[PDB]
Amino acid sequence: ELQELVQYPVEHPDKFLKFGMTPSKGVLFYGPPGCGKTLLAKAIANECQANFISIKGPELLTMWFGESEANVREIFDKARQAAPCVLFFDELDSIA
Amino acid sequence: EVGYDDIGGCRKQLAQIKEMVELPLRHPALFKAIGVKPPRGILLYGPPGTGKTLIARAVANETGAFFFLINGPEIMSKLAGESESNLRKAFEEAEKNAPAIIFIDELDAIAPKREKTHGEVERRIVSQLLTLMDGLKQRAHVIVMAATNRPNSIDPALRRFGRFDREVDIGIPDATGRLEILQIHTKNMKLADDVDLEQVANETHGHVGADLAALCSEAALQAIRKKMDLIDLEDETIDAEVMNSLAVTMDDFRWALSQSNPSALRETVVEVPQVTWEDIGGLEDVKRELQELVQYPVEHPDKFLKFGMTPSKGVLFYGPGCGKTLLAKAIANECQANFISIKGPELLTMWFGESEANVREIFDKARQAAPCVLFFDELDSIAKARGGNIGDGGGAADRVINQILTEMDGMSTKKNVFIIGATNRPDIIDPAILRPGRLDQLIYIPLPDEKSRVAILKANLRKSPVAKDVDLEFLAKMTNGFSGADLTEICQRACKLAIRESIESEIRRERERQTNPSAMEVEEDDPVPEIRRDHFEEAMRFARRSVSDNDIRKYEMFAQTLQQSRGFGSFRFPS
Amino acid sequence: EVGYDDIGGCRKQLAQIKEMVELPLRHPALFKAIGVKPPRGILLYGPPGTGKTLIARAVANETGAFFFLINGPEIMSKLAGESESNLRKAFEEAEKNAPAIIFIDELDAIAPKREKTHGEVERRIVSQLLTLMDGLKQRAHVIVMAATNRPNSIDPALRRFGRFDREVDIGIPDATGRLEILQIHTKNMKLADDVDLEQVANETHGHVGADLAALCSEAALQAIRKKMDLIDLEDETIDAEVMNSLAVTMDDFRWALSQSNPSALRETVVEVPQVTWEDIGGLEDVKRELQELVQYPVEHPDKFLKFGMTPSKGVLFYGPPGCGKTLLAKAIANECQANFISIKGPELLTMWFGESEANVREIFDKARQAAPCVLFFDELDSIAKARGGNIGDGGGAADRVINQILTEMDGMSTKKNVFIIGATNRPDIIDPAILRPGRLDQLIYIPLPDEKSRVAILKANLRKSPVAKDVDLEFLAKMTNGFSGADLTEICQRACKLAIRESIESEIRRERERQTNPSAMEVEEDDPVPEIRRDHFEEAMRFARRSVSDNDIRKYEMFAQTLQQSRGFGSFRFPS
Numbered sequence A: 001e002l003q004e005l006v007q008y009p010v011e012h013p014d015k016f017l018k019f020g021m022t023p024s025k026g027v028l029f030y031g032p033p034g035c036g037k038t039l040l041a042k043a044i045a046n047e048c049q050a051n052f053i054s055i056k057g058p059e060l061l062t063m064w065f066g067e068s069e070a071n072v073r074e075i076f077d078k079a080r081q082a083a084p085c086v087l088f089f090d091e092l093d094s095i096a
Numbered sequence B: 001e002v003g004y005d006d007i008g009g010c011r012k013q014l015a016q017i018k019e020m021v022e023l024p025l026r027h028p029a030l031f032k033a034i035g036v037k038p039p040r041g042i043l044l045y046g047p048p049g050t051g052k053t054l055i056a057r058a059v060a061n062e063t064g065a066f067f068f069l070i071n072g073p074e075i076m077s078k079l080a081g082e083s084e085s086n087l088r089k090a091f092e093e094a095e096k097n098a099p100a101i102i103f104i105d106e107l108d109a110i111a112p113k114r115e116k117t118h119g120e121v122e123r124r125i126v127s128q129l130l131t132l133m134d135g136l137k138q139r140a141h142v143i144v145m146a147a148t149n150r151p152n153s154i155d156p157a158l159r160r161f162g163r164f165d166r167e168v169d170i171g172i173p174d175a176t177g178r179l180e181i182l183q184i185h186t187k188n189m190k191l192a193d194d195v196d197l198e199q200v201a202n203e204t205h206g207h208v209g210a211d212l213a214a215l216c217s218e219a220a221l222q223a224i225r226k227k228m229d230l231i232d233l234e235d236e237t238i239d240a241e242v243m244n245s246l247a248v249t250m251d252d253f254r255w256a257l258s259q260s261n262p263s264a265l266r267e268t269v270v271e272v273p274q275v276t277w278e279d280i281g282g283l284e285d286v287k288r289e290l291q292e293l294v295q296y297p298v299e300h301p302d303k304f305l306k307f308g309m310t311p312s313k314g315v316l317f318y319g320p321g322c323g324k325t326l327l328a329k330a331i332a333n334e335c336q337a338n339f340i341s342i343k344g345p346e347l348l349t350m351w352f353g354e355s356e357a358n359v360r361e362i363f364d365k366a367r368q369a370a371p372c373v374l375f376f377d378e379l380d381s382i383a384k385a386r387g388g389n390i391g392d393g394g395g396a397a398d399r400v401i402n403q404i405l406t407e408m409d410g411m412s413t414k415k416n417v418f419i420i421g422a423t424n425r426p427d428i429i430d431p432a433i434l435r436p437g438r439l440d441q442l443i444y445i446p447l448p449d450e451k452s453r454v455a456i457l458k459a460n461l462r463k464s465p466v467a468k469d470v471d472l473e474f475l476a477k478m479t480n481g482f483s484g485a486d487l488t489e490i491c492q493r494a495c496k497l498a499i500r501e502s503i504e505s506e507i508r509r510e511r512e513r514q515t516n517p518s519a520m521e522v523e524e525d526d527p528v529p530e531i532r533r534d535h536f537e538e539a540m541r542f543a544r545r546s547v548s549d550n551d552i553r554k555y556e557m558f559a560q561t562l563q564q565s566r567g568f569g570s571f572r573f574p575s
Numbered sequence C: 001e002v003g004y005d006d007i008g009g010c011r012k013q014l015a016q017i018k019e020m021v022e023l024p025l026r027h028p029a030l031f032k033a034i035g036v037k038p039p040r041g042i043l044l045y046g047p048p049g050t051g052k053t054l055i056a057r058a059v060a061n062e063t064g065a066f067f068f069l070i071n072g073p074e075i076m077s078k079l080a081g082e083s084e085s086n087l088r089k090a091f092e093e094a095e096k097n098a099p100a101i102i103f104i105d106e107l108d109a110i111a112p113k114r115e116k117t118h119g120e121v122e123r124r125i126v127s128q129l130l131t132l133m134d135g136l137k138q139r140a141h142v143i144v145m146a147a148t149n150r151p152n153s154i155d156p157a158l159r160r161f162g163r164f165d166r167e168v169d170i171g172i173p174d175a176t177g178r179l180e181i182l183q184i185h186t187k188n189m190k191l192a193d194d195v196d197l198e199q200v201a202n203e204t205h206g207h208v209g210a211d212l213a214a215l216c217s218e219a220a221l222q223a224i225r226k227k228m229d230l231i232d233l234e235d236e237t238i239d240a241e242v243m244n245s246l247a248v249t250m251d252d253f254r255w256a257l258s259q260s261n262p263s264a265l266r267e268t269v270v271e272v273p274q275v276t277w278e279d280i281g282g283l284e285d286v287k288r289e290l291q292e293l294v295q296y297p298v299e300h301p302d303k304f305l306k307f308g309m310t311p312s313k314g315v316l317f318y319g320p321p322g323c324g325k326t327l328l329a330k331a332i333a334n335e336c337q338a339n340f341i342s343i344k345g346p347e348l349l350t351m352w353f354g355e356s357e358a359n360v361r362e363i364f365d366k367a368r369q370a371a372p373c374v375l376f377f378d379e380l381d382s383i384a385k386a387r388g389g390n391i392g393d394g395g396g397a398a399d400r401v402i403n404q405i406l407t408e409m410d411g412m413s414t415k416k417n418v419f420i421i422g423a424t425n426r427p428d429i430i431d432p433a434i435l436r437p438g439r440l441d442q443l444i445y446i447p448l449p450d451e452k453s454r455v456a457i458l459k460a461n462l463r464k465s466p467v468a469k470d471v472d473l474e475f476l477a478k479m480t481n482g483f484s485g486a487d488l489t490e491i492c493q494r495a496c497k498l499a500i501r502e503s504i505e506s507e508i509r510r511e512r513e514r515q516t517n518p519s520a521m522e523v524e525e526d527d528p529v530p531e532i533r534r535d536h537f538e539e540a541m542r543f544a545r546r547s548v549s550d551n552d553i554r555k556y557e558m559f560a561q562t563l564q565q566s567r568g569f570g571s572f573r574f575p576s
């Protein structure tokens, strides 16, 4: 499934364009701690040979406590510059 | 030279500038015998790279006025005490060649003071410029046009009467204007036949005229790199025929678009939505009511004036993915009025940041782009953020909604902006929003019917190749209570299944030639050229109803919570 | 030249300026034999484009005083160290031509320092200007008038005694003044007969004199574009007769109004409300009580002084929504012909959310300047609702905005003219301190309109709309057992909407017939629905609804009897 969602649009963009389907650009891994979600994201990034950016929970908590969310804009701009990239938001539920 | 043809984008403010400047310039002698004050200054503002200087130069050339360009930093870079001489000499020279147009590019550098006004010499420059601008003795016909990123960046005294009394927001070009900009920027490169500039234009959302030119140049450079370099036959001047032999292919443009990085994607878009009533399959009562409320006052303003009735300028859509945003876009498209959409994330950002003055800026932008349909999508987001069952200790009032109410109360003057609100939680919406003069006309958008579902499926599958074998009416009828979002998900899943099957099949077939090289090459074409019945059956296997019947029950409750009494249904006059 | 005729708006501060300046200027020799200090400086402030410079020039011309104009940036644009020479020479030249008027346009540039006072040379300019202004040796009769957007923008020392001791807020022109401004700005364009300038004036809310001139010019340019361009017959000078043949039509003015963008719609409006007691059909006890409280102290101040009674300067309207409290306040203001200032709930909520209650001080000062005025605080309970109402915050009813309002009211009453009127739909949650003596103590209850009141409300709502005599209005009013004013307005609006839709649909179909079957002889039968009929009103009433439930009326009745005059004194008799 990860191979599909990430690799297929780039390896075969023509076939995605033929059917007029825009591939999803977001995937949310859910599961118990320590099962390899971060490793899975790294592996999927490696297979596509695309840059990998990891935003762990401490960074999000720092942005939330400091009331400085403009860093999200900077992070997204950095991810945009390093394309192809896999922007991974590890442990996104930390703020909740 | 440069003219209206060079000015691309068809953004329809060039026409306004023309109407502004012909008679003052095209017929200057007329104003000599008629007592009227022409436009002494015009403030063109918008994102950088939108061609404001190009527009001014084209107007000057097409009207014959002597164009004078006063670069912001050109004068600012000069030594203090003699830059003032440069500005004064520029105005005198422009005065000599009456009629003349004085263009001040990057005006936010000569007079950037927003009442902060740091420094000493820059205050002198701003004050002297003010004296010159207000010093126009209405003699001759010098028109001073200035360029600025935003109206509030320049000194407010420059915005006052007689200095710059009228402003035009050039704004980002739209798909139609992006296409015309591409055409103007692609006219001497001998564009290939396969490339059409239409697909690129649609995918070019977020670019400006400068961005479009840069993308075209990058595509040309990719074409030059791909070919004519392998041969490496180069001289002092490349042969014209050799260079003409190359044609910019669609692949080069696609790569350039991938390498675009548009310079202001975030900037708000003021564009006539391309959505049409065809996309929505039904809502005939809702469609007619929307047509009434919006279109009737403008199509037949005289009849509204005859009965002394002021049409409501606010409508609040409530409902469960049912197409409220699409309905608003369709209604805007029918009236051919600009559409501005304020999604929930923007409101939440204004609320978290405690910056509600952005509401004032948003309303001003909507006012400038008239006729417009200011849509506040998912307006209940702030109430949800504060709770909804218990929430905060205070009432429903919040900073952002209060500012919106203040702007609406101070609105209606413009006679063109129309506020449309969409909310999935009508119970938690602030009651003040529904008071008269606000979004009082509540419209309920129900789950799409069978016919509506068929139309939604057709709209979602219009682009995708769908085999005639797969019956769409049966699928729509089968989906008893699927929402528009659910139908879209089903169509997307079917397309995904078809794409995966096609990719896997052609990949295997390629192994088959590599493993067993056939003596004669005869491709059988695509094993799956269009979406079939089995793909749709597998996709529907995963079909799901996002909207439960309990939330539909709550919406039905609110709807009957706007109950027209139960005793007047038989009201008859005494006769 | 320019005179009182050119000065439009009839805003009634030009009269005050005249009364200020005639004797100092019109009779300068009189002050030589009488020991009195005239007005050394007058500070005209208001929104830009209101004609302050025009007013000063007109006063100078009509009084014969030598007018001198000291442009703000003209001196500011000059080189440092020699601008001071320009200011000093300007005062000396004005001194020579006594009597003279020195006008300082855009005074907020020469002396903008609000005690922040950035820079060095500008401090010199402000101090030297202060020395000159205070240096007037009371000889000659030079009067220094200055223009500024707001009083607080200029240096406070300029506002002190002897520099600028009296201020006039020209303010935005009103409908009557907007109409007069349009007349003055439309006098040489040969305005068409169809255009009346009255409808445009009413729809011109939010414009200033400059805005009105710009709108008129835009309409003229639209007329010039629509015609005389198609012919394209142009020469060095357009023929006067050819240009006169065109008449500015109502359509051109309508388009210009659509393309106006008034330069200060948000600015607060100080205007005599046009609403009259006719709009409200009843409230005779309430009407008489309001007449007493407001009108009696001014119409007969002597009798109030005789009994040594100070009339209450605060009234709090309480009642269900949509019953006409705002309209009642406007009517009472209109009867006394006093300016009306309305502070709706959104403004209070903005001040509360932004933690900026100093705006209350500014609002009260503005009300004080525009005397006689009726300062109305519409929906004053908004802050209490925002904080809760059933449980609310942990603290009491006191809040920042209400506390500032109380402080201003306590510091008020000095003016003897501002009258505070408060309207609230939730009297239970209103702060009790608001009702203490010296505050809005006179509580007035506005009940749901009666049958006669309902008839009057329906007539007022339907006065503009063409209503057929067949539709009986008394029957409709009586039929509506408990409809509020808002409910009646909604019914009338729905009936008008139904009539408009039917007329549009019918004439549209009738046009298809002409197009589908071109008739040999054109004979329009006029409008198929020329006025609102019985069927339209029946369909509209089909959707009639009672916004105000009987339970909230029960709560209001409870509070009303919660202001119960005891139960043992009703028979009080003196011993005789």
Ligand SMILES: Cc1cc(OCc2nnc(SC3CCCC3)n2-c2cccnc2)ccc1-c1ccc(S(C)(=O)=O)cc1
Pocket (backbone or CB within 6 Å): B293, B294, B295, B297, B298, B301, B302, B304, B305, B306, B307, B308, B309, B310, B311, B312, B313, B335, B337, B371, B372, B373, B415, B416, B417, B418, C464, C465
């Ligand atoms: C005649 C009139 C037109 C109007 O405006 C019409 C209008 N133009 N562009 C637009 S906007 C654009 C259209 C599509 C997207 C938005 N509108 C408009 C107005 C209201 C609601 N929707 C549109 C207002 C009010 C009136 C009048 C009604 C009664 C009376 S009397 C004293 O009782 O006789 C006087 C004046």
Ligand SMILES: Cc1cc(OCc2nnc(SC3CCCC3)n2-c2cccnc2)ccc1-c1ccc(S(C)(=O)=O)cc1
Pocket (backbone or CB within 6 Å): C293, C294, C295, C297, C298, C301, C302, C304, C305, C306, C307, C308, C309, C310, C311, C312, C313, C336, C338, C372, C373, C374, C416, C417, C418, C419
């Ligand atoms: C004589 C007097 C007049 C007054 O003011 C009258 C007034 N003029 N403009 C206005 S305002 C405008 C009118 C319509 C809108 C608002 N008012 C006014 C005053 C109070 C309430 N409403 C209006 C105050 C107080 C007194 C006095 C009473 C007793 C005594 S003793 C020592 O016991 O003998 C001394 C002084």
Ligand SMILES: Nc1ncnc2c1ncn2[C@@H]1O[C@H](COP(=O)(O)OP(=O)(O)O)[C@@H](O)[C@H]1O
Pocket (backbone or CB within 6 Å): B006, B007, B008, B009, B047, B048, B049, B050, B051, B052, B053, B054, B055, B105, B147, B181, B184, B185, B208, B209, B210, B213
């Ligand atoms: N609609 C357009 N048609 C042709 N060129 C455009 C257009 N829009 C932008 N450009 C390009 O933008 C370049 C510079 O942008 P400019 O006109 O100076 O606007 P700004 O001053 O706001 O940056 C120009 O050299 C021009 O090539």
Ligand SMILES: Nc1ncnc2c1ncn2[C@@H]1O[C@H](COP(=O)(O)OP(=O)(O)O)[C@@H](O)[C@H]1O
Pocket (backbone or CB within 6 Å): B161, C006, C007, C008, C009, C047, C048, C049, C050, C051, C052, C053, C054, C055, C105, C147, C181, C184, C185, C208, C209, C210, C213
């Ligand atoms: N009531 C009025 N009657 C005639 N002209 C007015 C009026 N109000 C404003 N104007 C116009 O406003 C123009 C400039 O405004 P101005 O008098 O300088 O006020 P301010 O200095 O505050 O901007 C004038 O040229 C005049 O035509």
